Amino acid sequence: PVNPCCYYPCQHQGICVRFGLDRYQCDCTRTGYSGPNCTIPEIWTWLRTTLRPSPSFIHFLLTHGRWLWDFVNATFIRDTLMRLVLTVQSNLIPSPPTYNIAHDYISWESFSNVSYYTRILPSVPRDCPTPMGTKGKKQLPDAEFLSRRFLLRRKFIPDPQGTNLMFAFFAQHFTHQFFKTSGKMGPGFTKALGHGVDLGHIYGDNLERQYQLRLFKDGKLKYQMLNGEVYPPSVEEAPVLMHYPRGIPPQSQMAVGQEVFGLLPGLMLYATIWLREHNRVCDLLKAEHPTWGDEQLFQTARLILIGETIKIVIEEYVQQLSGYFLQLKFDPELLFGAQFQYRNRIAMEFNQLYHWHPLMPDSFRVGPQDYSYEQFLFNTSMLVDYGVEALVDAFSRQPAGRIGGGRNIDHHILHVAVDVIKESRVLRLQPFNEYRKRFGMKPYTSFQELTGEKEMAAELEELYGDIDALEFYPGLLLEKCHPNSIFGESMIEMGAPFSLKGLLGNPICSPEYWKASTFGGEVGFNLVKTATLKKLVCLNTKTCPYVSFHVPD
Amino acid sequence: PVNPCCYYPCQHQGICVRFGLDRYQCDCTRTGYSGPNCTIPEIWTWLRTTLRPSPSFIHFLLTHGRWLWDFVNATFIRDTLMRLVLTVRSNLIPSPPTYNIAHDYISWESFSNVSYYTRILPSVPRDCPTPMGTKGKKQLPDAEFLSRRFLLRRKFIPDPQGTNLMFAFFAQHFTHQFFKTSGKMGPGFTKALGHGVDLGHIYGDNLERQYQLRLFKDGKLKYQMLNGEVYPPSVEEAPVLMHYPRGIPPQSQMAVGQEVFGLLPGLMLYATIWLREHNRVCDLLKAEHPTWGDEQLFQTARLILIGETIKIVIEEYVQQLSGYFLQLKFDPELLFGAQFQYRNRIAMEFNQLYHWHPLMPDSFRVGPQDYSYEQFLFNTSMLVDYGVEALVDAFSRQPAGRIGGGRNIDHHILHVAVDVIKESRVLRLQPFNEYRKRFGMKPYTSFQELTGEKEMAAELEELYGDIDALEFYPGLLLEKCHPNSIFGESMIEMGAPFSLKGLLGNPICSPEYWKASTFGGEVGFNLVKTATLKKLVCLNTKTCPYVSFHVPD
Ligand SMILES: *[C@@H]1O[C@H](CO)[C@@H](O[C@H]2O[C@H](CO)[C@@H](O[C@@H]3O[C@H](CO[C@H]4O[C@H](CO[C@H]5O[C@H](CO)[C@@H](O)[C@H](O)[C@@H]5O)[C@@H](O)[C@H](O)[C@@H]4O)[C@@H](O)[C@H](O)[C@@H]3O)[C@H](O)[C@H]2NC(C)=O)[C@H](O)[C@H]1NC(C)=O
Ligand code: HEM
Ligand code: HEM
Ligand SMILES: *[C@@H]1O[C@H](CO)[C@@H](O[C@@H]2O[C@H](CO)[C@@H](O[C@@H]3O[C@H](CO)[C@@H](O)[C@H](O)[C@@H]3O)[C@H](O)[C@H]2NC(C)=O)[C@H](O)[C@H]1NC(C)=O
Ligand SMILES: *[C@@H]1O[C@H](CO)[C@@H](O[C@@H]2O[C@H](CO)[C@@H](O[C@H]3O[C@H](CO)[C@@H](O)[C@H](O)[C@@H]3O)[C@H](O)[C@H]2NC(C)=O)[C@H](O)[C@H]1NC(C)=O
Numbered sequence A: 001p002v003n004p005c006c007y008y009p010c011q012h013q014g015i016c017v018r019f020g021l022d023r024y025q026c027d028c029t030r031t032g033y034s035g036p037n038c039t040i041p042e043i044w045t046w047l048r049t050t051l052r053p054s055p056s057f058i059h060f061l062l063t064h065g066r067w068l069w070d071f072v073n074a075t076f077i078r079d080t081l082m083r084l085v086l087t088v089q090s091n092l093i094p095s096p097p098t099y100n101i102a103h104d105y106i107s108w109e110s111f112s113n114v115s116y117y118t119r120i121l122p123s124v125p126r127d128c129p130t131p132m133g134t135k136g137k138k139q140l141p142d143a144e145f146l147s148r149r150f151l152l153r154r155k156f157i158p159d160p161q162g163t164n165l166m167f168a169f170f171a172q173h174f175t176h177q178f179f180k181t182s183g184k185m186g187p188g189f190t191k192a193l194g195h196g197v198d199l200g201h202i203y204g205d206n207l208e209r210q211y212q213l214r215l216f217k218d219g220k221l222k223y224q225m226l227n228g229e230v231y232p233p234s235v236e237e238a239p240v241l242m243h244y245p246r247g248i249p250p251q252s253q254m255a256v257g258q259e260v261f262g263l264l265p266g267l268m269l270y271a272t273i274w275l276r277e278h279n280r281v282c283d284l285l286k287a288e289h290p291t292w293g294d295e296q297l298f299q300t301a302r303l304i305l306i307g308e309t310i311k312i313v314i315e316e317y318v319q320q321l322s323g324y325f326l327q328l329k330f331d332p333e334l335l336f337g338a339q340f341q342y343r344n345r346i347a348m349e350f351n352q353l354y355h356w357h358p359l360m361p362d363s364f365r366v367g368p369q370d371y372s373y374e375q376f377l378f379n380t381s382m383l384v385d386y387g388v389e390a391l392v393d394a395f396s397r398q399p400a401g402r403i404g405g406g407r408n409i410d411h412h413i414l415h416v417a418v419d420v421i422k423e424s425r426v427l428r429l430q431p432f433n434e435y436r437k438r439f440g441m442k443p444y445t446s447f448q449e450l451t452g453e454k455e456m457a458a459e460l461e462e463l464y465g466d467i468d469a470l471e472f473y474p475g476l477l478l479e480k481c482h483p484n485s486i487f488g489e490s491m492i493e494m495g496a497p498f499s500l501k502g503l504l505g506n507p508i509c510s511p512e513y514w515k516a517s518t519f520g521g522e523v524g525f526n527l528v529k530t531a532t533l534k535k536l537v538c539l540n541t542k543t544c545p546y547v548s549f550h551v552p553d
Numbered sequence B: 001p002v003n004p005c006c007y008y009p010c011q012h013q014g015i016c017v018r019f020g021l022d023r024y025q026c027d028c029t030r031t032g033y034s035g036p037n038c039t040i041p042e043i044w045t046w047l048r049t050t051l052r053p054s055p056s057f058i059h060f061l062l063t064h065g066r067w068l069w070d071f072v073n074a075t076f077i078r079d080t081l082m083r084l085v086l087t088v089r090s091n092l093i094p095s096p097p098t099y100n101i102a103h104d105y106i107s108w109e110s111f112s113n114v115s116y117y118t119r120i121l122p123s124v125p126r127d128c129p130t131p132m133g134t135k136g137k138k139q140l141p142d143a144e145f146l147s148r149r150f151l152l153r154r155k156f157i158p159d160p161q162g163t164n165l166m167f168a169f170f171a172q173h174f175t176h177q178f179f180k181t182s183g184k185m186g187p188g189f190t191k192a193l194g195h196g197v198d199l200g201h202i203y204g205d206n207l208e209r210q211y212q213l214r215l216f217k218d219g220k221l222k223y224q225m226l227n228g229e230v231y232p233p234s235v236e237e238a239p240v241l242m243h244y245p246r247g248i249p250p251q252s253q254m255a256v257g258q259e260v261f262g263l264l265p266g267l268m269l270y271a272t273i274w275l276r277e278h279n280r281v282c283d284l285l286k287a288e289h290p291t292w293g294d295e296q297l298f299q300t301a302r303l304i305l306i307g308e309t310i311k312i313v314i315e316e317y318v319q320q321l322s323g324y325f326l327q328l329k330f331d332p333e334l335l336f337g338a339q340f341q342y343r344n345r346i347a348m349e350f351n352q353l354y355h356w357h358p359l360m361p362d363s364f365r366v367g368p369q370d371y372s373y374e375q376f377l378f379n380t381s382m383l384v385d386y387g388v389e390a391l392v393d394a395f396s397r398q399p400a401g402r403i404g405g406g407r408n409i410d411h412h413i414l415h416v417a418v419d420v421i422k423e424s425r426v427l428r429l430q431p432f433n434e435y436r437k438r439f440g441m442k443p444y445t446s447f448q449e450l451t452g453e454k455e456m457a458a459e460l461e462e463l464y465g466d467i468d469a470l471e472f473y474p475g476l477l478l479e480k481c482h483p484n485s486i487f488g489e490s491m492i493e494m495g496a497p498f499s500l501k502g503l504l505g506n507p508i509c510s511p512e513y514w515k516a517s518t519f520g521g522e523v524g525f526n527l528v529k530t531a532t533l534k535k536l537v538c539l540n541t542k543t544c545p546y547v548s549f550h551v552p553d
């Protein structure tokens, strides 16, 4: 007998469990539903269903009515709605976490072993008719072909939301502290054990590495002086493992928290800024705590920089992304009255989803110069050649690509998307339409409805055979965007739950940690509260360039 | 100049922070207090403090007036009070955890590094004039001498509550899954990384070990047949590091989850019982799920066993210990309405407080046989010679020692108590009275008020010089016991918050985990719900012996 759970016979987050030889049952516990498949709603659930407006209608509300939102943001409604957005979206994410690559069920190993990525939906059972369940063709489409025909950039489609390369490199930097898939252990495993905003891309994902990067005086990180500017130290002074092209001299190899950050100037840019911010914070702490040792200075600066990161990510980063007329607000005290777990486990789906390579351009315009991919990648002098000011100015001015829509990944890095789709088959990620339901959306009935056009849809229909078969990452990047937006509804409705849970689930946001003393007092606490991208750069530079998550005007 | 925080200025959980050269500031955030030392009470706090009766008064109501309690236990008031017990107790424990031996302040490293025990009060600063802060003598009293005079048994004092050796051994077994101090790392460090009821004393503290214990058939653990009965395998078959006396060969030594269980038959007794249960559960689980592989069977059996452990501990173990007339109840649903973090970190103070060596008798009686310590300690054949039935009957009939009150540790194991005090001093654990205040009690104003007598108190006053210099462990053990109880006011009021947070803070108690599917359905769920000490033994033995946490009549 075939595995019944492969029909995904249970709705609204019921758990399919195999009983006997050919039977299944569903645990509808606290899903709001009753019956064999969990399809009969309870009186409260039912009432909330008819009164629930569609995610599209709410997206419209958040992106329209300039007059209403000016009023809202200047009142308490701002706090009310922020609380609402925080609790409602985060709660889609389980906590404690549930499944992983090895276990499609709750276990003590899945709870304790942090080297695993987690998952929101279990893998597609191995003992089933099609690789995506029961629907679709015997074999899935070629990963290279799907990229070439649907994801490969022809002409450059800029972001209509005005997103720049200062954002793209921030996104890439930031996300790589909690996305470190391991090569040795394989797919579904991770090296970044903080599982969130620990800043291990600055300090290191292990103690040994951290100790090697630290000056062990004044709580500071090691640094070097090139042309009068403070840069991260050479590998000769901080002998940590760094991935540089073999043959490159060690004196030109810079050492930072994250191994891959030397391969791109944009990465090594932010690495410098944050390092330069860390030591600056030590200078402020030491002035008010002359008696504090090196360890106290270091550990307190880290917490201040963890706070600063989340403040900028929520109020500036997600702001630019969402395009919302709601002024987003970082205030942990909002959740102090609700049931919220201050813990987080990074999920493979969020890893898959955060592959935002369409942000990368055709070239890299720095002042009058234009730089090719072969001049930008691996170049180790560019950062020290131009300086922070000049590179931040150049990245804040150049537009970034539109993520959704399709055909917008520059040929140089298309291979990544190919491997993403490949990896999304070793992990046996459920089909896109199943995730639609998990994150509270209606499944698509056609490829037409998915893309909003006719041409590119009809070809996908022939390849996949069924919309119920469409894969996760292709689904996200081919779906029609919201009008004049950066990506589709699915990226928002699925991304944000993961995103917000990570930010607010950080221990520093808890009632226990969100105190003045935690950050060395009012001075440190205000540094978190008033943090800003512009301030992160311009307080650490000689001059102040144009710095923003969006192109001028 | 003298460190201001040595005086412990900040009352009611306010945090002392050094500013400038000789100044300090208190962070009264969310303590309920205002002002420089956190002594000015807010409107609600004042109301709370005047209306709140003394701990001793509550202990009176809970331990008296049986007629009222018969009524209470058969009504919803049982659930109401239990919730109050759960929420008010656990609240006294920081979550996420605060400090460790390295940091007397909040740091990311303290949060991330699960190798550390946590702590509730910071250490006594090294620059303080006296070892305990500001009060007492330049040198503390000799640790060996303190044990001899005040902790060493003369005549045997049985626990007035009727507590038996079945309890005493359960305690030692149960606790040694989350008390595993690292000799190679030093005090303040731990090997038990599950930090609670993970059953890592049955399955081992690491994966490679767990794997060696497992049959890898039907989710079962390895075992061997002896005399027709089920016993843990030899090291020869399951090669794991076991701490046995030098000269005892691998075939002679048994393999279990905790490395030290071979040293005592009572400890190895429970290793057998819990192993039989695990394999017994797997048999039930396979009948319900024939299509299940080995891994899922093992992982589910682990959760059911964790379930049963928490059920028994709360409803029988804590019951006998507390001696309350309130029928204590295990139901995670009680907490589904309040703010509760399903996370736990073991504290060095919980470690220190659980050294319940007074429980151990002058000698061990097994029917008509009287075994001395030298016959009992490291016996390899006693378990197999007698069997489970016979030794459950034996330990259940023999009285255990009264824990508090003083002079009740057998000379054989008095060296343990010595080392606890010496370790405390390395750990730089705050005075006993400082811990009184932190667990909502008033400090003792004299040694007479502590002990409830004249002689022992006078000698202690001479040794310590002041009551505010009295140490944690000696304090807990020399305090006047509640009338007819096992220990005093402090062991309950300091032990309970750690204990209940450890049980209910287990992720299986979370609304995400607490459902039938987690335990393979209803059969597994009911095993947890109806779990019992008597059943744990008697369902795994040929005959039922006397089984209880108290002696007969
Ligand atoms: C949780 O936390 C615990 C406690 O911190 C931690 O314990 C262990 O880890 C730390 C760090 O590994 C150990 O600390 C010791 O640190 C001293 C450092 O002094 C030296 O510093 C300079 C660097 O030394 C050299 O490093 C390498 C290797 O040789 C090389 O590049 C150079 O040669 C370089 O000079 C140097 O000036 C000089 O050598 C100094 O002596 C080390 O000397 C020592 O060897 C340790 O590494 C602790 O000892 C560890 N144990 C304990 C009980 O504290 C855990 O690791 C952590 N757990 C997790 C999961 O993170
Ligand atoms: C020109 C710049 C970029 C280059 C050269 C690049 C290249 C790569 C490469 C080579 C991989 C690993 C592929 C593999 O072996 O599996 C990768 C993965 C990834 N990319 Fe990029 N990419 C770029 C930009 C971005 C941006 C802007 C983002 C947005 C945040 C992003 C997000 C990710 C993520 C989250 C991973 C997976 C990380 C992990 O699991 O270890 N990338 N990219
Ligand atoms: C005759 C039986 C017992 C023996 C032989 C024994 C022996 C020991 C020894 C040798 C240590 C290590 C301390 C040191 O040497 O520094 C220890 C610690 C300890 N004991 Fe016992 N003990 C016994 C009974 C008990 C009981 C009944 C309890 C009650 C629960 C208990 C609780 C503990 C705890 C919690 C520790 C610290 C564990 C750790 O730090 O890893 N012991 N004991
Ligand atoms: C290992 O622990 C075992 C516990 O069984 C010890 O062996 C047992 O020792 C007792 C005496 O202490 C033996 O009792 C003897 O037989 C009868 C009772 O059956 C009794 O009336 C006699 O007076 C006599 O002492 C008991 O039979 C014996 N069991 C076996 C199988 O030999 C042993 O002494 C312990 N090891 C150490 C180092 O003490
Ligand atoms: C490392 O980053 C460098 C940028 O900071 C870059 O070197 C720069 O390359 C440009 C373009 O080739 C040079 O400009 C040259 O070409 C123009 C004509 O297009 C001439 O008018 C100029 O006089 C000049 O010869 C820059 O001079 C050069 N910058 C510096 C400071 O030397 C590298 O491309 C990056 N590294 C690699 C290996 O590609």
Ligand SMILES: *[C@@H]1O[C@H](CO)[C@@H](O[C@H]2O[C@H](CO)[C@@H](O[C@@H]3O[C@H](CO)[C@@H](O)[C@H](O)[C@@H]3O)[C@H](O)[C@H]2NC(C)=O)[C@H](O)[C@H]1NC(C)=O
Pocket: A102, A113, A115, A116, A184, A185, A186, B206, B207, B208, B211
């Ligand atoms: C978190 O989970 C990881 C995967 O379960 C685990 O990695 C390791 O898991 C096992 C056990 O150590 C190893 O599996 C094999 O065991 C067989 C025994 O027959 C050997 O034939 C084989 O050589 C291998 O050792 C894996 O090697 C190993 N890695 C992977 C990717 O599976 C982690 O240890 C665990 N982390 C913690 C902290 O427990």
Ligand SMILES: *[C@@H]1O[C@H](CO)[C@@H](O[C@H]2O[C@H](CO)[C@@H](O)[C@H](O)[C@H]2NC(C)=O)[C@H](O)[C@H]1NC(C)=O
Pocket: A007, A009, A036, A037, A039
């Ligand atoms: C619960 O779901 C199952 C499986 O999806 C339903 O069982 C049927 O589903 C098909 C479409 O309705 C039928 O054609 C099949 O006879 C049967 N298939 C399987 C695999 O069981 C079932 O009807 C659902 N029940 C309810 C009440 O909605």
Ligand SMILES: *[C@H]1O[C@H](CO)[C@@H](O[C@H]2O[C@H](CO)[C@@H](O)[C@H](O)[C@H]2NC(C)=O)[C@H](O)[C@H]1NC(C)=O
Pocket: B004, B007, B008, B009, B036, B037
């Ligand atoms: C609370 O803080 C300090 C510390 O307990 C209190 O004691 C200070 O002042 C007292 C004189 O009025 C003396 O007891 C001590 O000399 C002094 N202690 C120190 C360490 O300087 C003080 O009374 C309280 N402060 C306030 C503002 O009420």
Ligand SMILES: CCCCCCCCO[C@@H]1O[C@H](CO)[C@@H](O)[C@H](O)[C@H]1O
Pocket: B054, B055, B056, B058, B059, B061, B062, B081, B084, B085, B088, B089, B092, B439, B440, B493, B497
């Ligand atoms: C009728 C008896 C009511 C008992 C139920 C209330 C349980 C409160 O338990 C209370 O915990 C507090 C915090 O740890 C302590 O300070 C109190 O002394 C303790 O009794």
Ligand SMILES: C[C@@H](C(=O)O)c1ccc(-c2ccccc2)c(F)c1
Pocket: B085, B089, B318, B321, B322, B324, B328, B491, B492, B494, B495, B496, B497, B499, B500
């Ligand atoms: C019933 C409950 C309470 O809060 O009173 C309670 C909870 C825990 C303990 C307890 C105390 C010390 C070690 C282990 C358990 C205890 F003695 C009493």
